[PDB]
Amino acid sequence: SPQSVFSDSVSSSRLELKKQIIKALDLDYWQGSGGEIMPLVLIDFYKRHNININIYLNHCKVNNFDKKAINLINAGNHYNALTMNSRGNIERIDVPGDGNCLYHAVVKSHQITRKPKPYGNELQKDKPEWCILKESLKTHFDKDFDQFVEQVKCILISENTHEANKILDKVAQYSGVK
């Protein structure tokens, strides 16, 4: 009647600690550390589905375009998409300047070239494409959290704030520093 046989992949209090860390990082607030995390999670989710993401910062030379990739530009704390026109042009496609420009820019880039989509299904047809993508990325961060811990640490160190240092203490305890 009682449980005699055991195997456990994870601890209960360790899972709660991970959930508290994810909540404090606040992935819906792009101006803080959550806004550095979501582009790394985007690249990894796309890579795992055999699609390349390339991000361009400010005004840069842009030496060789890879048309088969999802191409994005971040200049001025805003994401837009990039594409090629008139046999060689490189053009910027504007997306709304709300807090969700990263996910709008990816959807817009799939729309302009009909590039294969790694997200979504017919159960969410009442839901916007940019929402399905964003929620797929938060799920991925939660389930493969252990693969992003070193990156999360470096992001928090580089922010240099009281708020980030308190989160860094919880990350050090999770990684097993004693």
Partner: protein
């Protein structure tokens, strides 16, 4: 004596540099620009839990042969 070190971005892109213990942090940033195209004022480097400062040398941080530095860029927007 010149030694080999690695510089890994948070996406996992790794590059190899050859450096001297007496090279400054800002010189290391120039060598990263020579290989990856990132301007020094977009670069933040981390080693052993500490952000490396302009005006200091690699030796100040006891960086050794085959050490790995972490390169942090600002990607946020939204």
């Amino acid at each position: 004596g010149p030694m080999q070190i690695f510089v890994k971005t948070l996406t996992g892109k790794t590059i190899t540099l050859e450096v001297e213990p007496s090279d400054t942090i800002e010189n290391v940033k120039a060598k990263i620009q020579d290989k990856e195209g990132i301007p020094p004022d977009q670069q933040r480097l981390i080693f052993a839990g500490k952000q490396l400062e302009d005006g200091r040398t690699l030796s100040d941080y006891n960086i050794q042969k085959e050490s790995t530095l972490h390169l942090v860029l600002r990607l946020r927007g939204x």
